[PDB]
Write a protein that binds this ligand. Structure first.
Ligand SMILES: NCCC[C@@H](O)[C@H](N)C(=O)O
Ligand SMILES: [Fe+3]
Length: 325
């Protein structure tokens, strides 16, 4: 179903592998140095690969995502962790490859309130949150959403590198362009109106944690930007329409998603970049075993402009403090 594909040749994958040796800082404990090294080393990547990533980053008429195949094979991978607190992905060779590609596109960033501000988060199924609307769910379908729909500091891109796949775990992608193509002129105009409130994801709450922007935000529109290249903010589960027509238009978006969404089953060596302004994403049900061989993705976030979050970070810091989300 996915169209926007970059297939690395054996020679390009070998170059990536060699260029990763230039990235030596600890991804977790020296995140800024690690990301800055990746940004500099990315100049040594194959020009064909860099051109495709810069074109995708510019964004104009991009498909809302880019699937990269042919990354260097995942060797001596540790068992899939049963929880996300181990940050196992952040010390694998796959994370330096992911950093190099990410830093072509934009600046890597992390959030104190999302997976403890780890540079790379382990996206692994949770036994506890299996039936939850989170990255660690599995027994229920992860509903269509913009990453951090509630936050003005939300990432510009979501980066997912596959360490272990699950054949039943499908990633669903649906662009703002695909949505607008199914709607009437009236629905598009209403989606551009500030008719939906949104709340801070439960997972972002903590004892003594107050957000500068509160728990409930908005009303905001779902659609914005250029008529021919619209931006989307959506959260099926969290956004609430202010009126009866606003609740129905949210249902219209959901139906268009089920009818038009594209799917892809992430496999080892693959990497998916999602344009968080141009597309929404979801994930199918799958049945994890919690035996060390479960689906395991390395998630990271990208912003075009690191200055937008400077008020929320420390000097030479890559982590957005919780209260600013
Ligand atoms: N209801 C929205 C859930 C969205 C999900 O991607 C969340 N940001 C997570 O990683 O747990
Ligand atoms: Fe997500």
């Amino acid at each position: 179903e996915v169209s926007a594909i970059l297939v690395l040749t054996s020679s390009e994958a070998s170059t990536l592998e060699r260029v990763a040796d230039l990235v030596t800082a600890h991804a977790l404990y020296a995140a800024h140095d690690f990301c800055a090294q990746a940004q500099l080393a990315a100049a040594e990547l194959p020009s064909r690969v860099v051109a495709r990533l810069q074109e995708f980053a510019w964004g104009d008429m991009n498909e809302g995502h880019l699937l990269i195949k042919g990354l260097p094979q995942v060797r001596s991978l540790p068992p899939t962790p049963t929880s996300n607190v181990h940050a196992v992905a952040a010390t694998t060779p796959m994370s330096r490859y992911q950093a190099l590609i990410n830093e072509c596109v934009g600046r890597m960033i992390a959030y104190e309130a999302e997976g403890h501000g780890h540079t790379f988060q382990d996206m692994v199924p949770s036994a506890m949150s299996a039936h939850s609307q989170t990255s660690l769910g599995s027994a229920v379908e992860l509903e269509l959403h913009t990453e951090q729909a509630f936050s003005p500091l939300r990432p510009d891109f979501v980066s997912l590198a596959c360490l272990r796949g699950d054949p039943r775990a499908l990633t669903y992608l649906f662009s703002a362009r695909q949505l607008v193509a199914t709607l009437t002129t009236q629905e598009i105009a209403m989606l551009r109106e500030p008719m939906w409130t949104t709340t801070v994801d439960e997972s972002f709450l903590a004892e003594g944690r107050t957000f500068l922007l509160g728990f409930e935000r908005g009303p905001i529109p779902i659609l914005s930007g250029a008529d021919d290249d619209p931006f989307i903010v959506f959260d099926q589960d969290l956004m609430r329409g202010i009126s009866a027509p606003a609740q129905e238009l949210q249902q219209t978006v959901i139906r268009a998603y089920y009818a038009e969404r594209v799917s892809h089953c992430l496999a080892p060596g693959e990497m998916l970049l999602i344009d968080n302004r141009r597309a929404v994403h979801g994930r199918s049900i799958f049945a994890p075993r919690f035996d060390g061989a479960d689906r395991f993705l390395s998630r990271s976030f990208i912003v075009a402009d690191g200055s937008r979050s400077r008020h929320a970070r420390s000097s030479f810091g890559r982590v957005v403090s919780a209260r600013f989300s």
